[PDB]
Amino acid sequence: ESNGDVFETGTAEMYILSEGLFNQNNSSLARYSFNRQRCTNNYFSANNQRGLGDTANDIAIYGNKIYVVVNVSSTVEVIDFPTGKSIRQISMLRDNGSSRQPRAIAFDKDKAYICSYDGTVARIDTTSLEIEEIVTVGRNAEDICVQNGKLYVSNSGGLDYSGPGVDTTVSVIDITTFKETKKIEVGPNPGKILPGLEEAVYVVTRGTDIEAGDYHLVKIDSRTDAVAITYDEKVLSFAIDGPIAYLYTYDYQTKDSANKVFDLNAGTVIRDNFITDGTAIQTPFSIQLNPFSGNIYITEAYNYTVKGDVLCFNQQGQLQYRLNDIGLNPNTVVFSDKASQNE
Numbered sequence: 133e134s135n136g137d138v139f140e141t142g143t144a145e146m147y148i149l150s151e152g153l154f155n156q157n158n159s160s161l162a163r164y165s166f167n168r169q170r171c172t173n174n175y176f177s178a179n180n181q182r183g184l185g186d187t188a189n190d191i192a193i194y195g196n197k198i199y200v201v202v203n204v205s206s207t208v209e210v211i212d213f214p215t216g217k218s219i220r221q222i223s224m225l226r227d228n229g230s231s232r233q234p235r236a237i238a239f240d241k242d243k244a245y246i247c248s249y250d251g252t253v254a255r256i257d258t259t260s261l262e263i264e265e266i267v268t269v270g271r272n273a274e275d276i277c278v279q280n281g282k283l284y285v286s287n288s289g290g291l292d293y294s295g296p297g298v299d300t301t302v303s304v305i306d307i308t309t310f311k312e313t314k315k316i317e318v319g320p321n322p323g324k325i326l327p328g329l330e331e332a333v334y335v336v337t338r339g340t341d342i343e344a345g346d347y348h349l350v351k352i353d354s355r356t357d358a359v360a361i362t363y364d365e366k367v368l369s370f371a372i373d374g375p376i377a378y379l380y381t382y383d384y385q386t387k388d389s390a391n392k393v394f395d396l397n398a399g400t401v402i403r404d405n406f407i408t409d410g411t412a413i414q415t416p417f418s419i420q421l422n423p424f425s426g427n428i429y430i431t432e433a434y435n436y437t438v439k440g441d442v443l444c445f446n447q448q449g450q451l452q453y454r455l456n457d458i459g460l461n462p463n464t465v466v467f468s469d470k471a472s473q474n475e
């Protein structure tokens with residue numbers, strides 16, 4: 133079930149979200165307690181006697197609640213952090229009752245913001261857990277983050293590729309008014325979006341035909357709401373640590389991949405292979421930092437039909453530990469420096 137000493141500094145627990153497979157209704161949530169050295173592979177269903185659903189796509193801890201965005205079940209599952217017990221299942225539906233298909237969540241003050249493939253952002257109150265307001269953005273909204281009092285939302289248009297084609301913009305929402313103020317042109321099929329230093333926002337663009345590998349990283353200046361830099365590096369997903377990005381790209385035709393350390397100030401590669409100890413990853417499926425230790429966490433999805441792994445590296449590219457067979461297509465790892473009250 134693991135290799136290496138399962139250890140983290142400054143961290144009580146980790147949560148690993150697994151999306152399962154599209155239309156197979158088999159998402160799952162694992163919890164690892166560093167404090168108790170205990171892994172629970174089915175943390176949501178063990179405590180709630182039902183499954184998370186189909187294509188669980190994002191997870192975050194905010195305040196003292198865990199939020200899981202479940203894309204195809206079209207819900208936001210809100211969970212009490214101390215107990216692991218469901219507080220509310222928030223159905224995300226269009227005015228006609230159809231699925232919005234939510235994707236990602238971000239937070240500011242006492243509000244949560246969920247973007248959805250129907251082209252909307254919903255504001256939820258973190259106390260009442262009611263949906264308060266809906267605003268339209270661009271097409272097939274994919275990811276969302278907060279910077280400088282504003283929301284930034286990638287309008288992928290990914291589901292539209294065969295119709296009008298993919299979309300090409302990041303929507304900007306003023307949080308105070310909750311109104312869309314601008315659509316910034318960034319390039320085709322925007323995806324993962326993250327805030328960085330000095331009011332920056334970084335977004336991946338995946339091209340008009342995602343399979344072809346026309347991938348870029350784009351930097352937006354949130355002071356002027358305009359593109360500052362377009363890099364040439366092929367980037368499919370990334371994580372930010374100050375002026376350094378830890379990133380990967382994947383070739384859906386050849387199945388080759390690369391995981392790299394990248395200098396965001398220079399636009400040049402620091403290390404062509406992030407991993408320095410020979411550890412092999414076949415299908416990198418997520419990348420993120422543990423904010424309490426600085427370690428790099430990458431998930432492994434294999435051929436998408438067998439359970440994947442979570443790998444923990446230091447910034448020097450040395451594997452600290454891995455947890456294997458954690459869930460089907462693990463896509464997000466989040467961390468708590470406070471222990472829950474659940475064994």
Ligand code: B12
Pocket residue numbers: 151152153154187189203204233288290291293321338342343384385435436437461
């Ligand atoms: C690999 C993959 C792809 C590959 C597939 C081909 C390849 N070269 O490998 C590529 C990169 C082309 C791809 C593209 C897209 N897909 Co895709 N991707 C997947 C992934 C990771 C695994 C699919 C797989 O191999 N599965 C297991 C095999 C054994 O089962 P399968 O039924 O044979 O799988 C087939 C379908 O998944 C199909 N497929 C792949 N993507 C999509 C998307 C849609 C909308 C449909 C109808 C079918 C489809 O291709 C697979 C092989 O034929 C899943 C993850 C998941 N399932 O949770 C998503 C997932 C199915 N993909 C998704 C998305 C969003 C996309 C894109 C819109 C991405 C984008 N452009 O922004 C496009 C749309 C299709 C297109 N061709 O343009 C979403 C669909 C969610 C939704 N509500 O519609 C999922 C669930 C990912 C997620 N959200 O977590 N994808």
Ligand code: NA
Pocket residue numbers: 159160161162173174175176177178184
């Ligand atoms: Na579960």
Ligand code: NA
Pocket residue numbers: none
């Ligand atoms: Na469809």
Ligand SMILES: [O-]
Pocket residue numbers: none
């Ligand atoms: O995908």
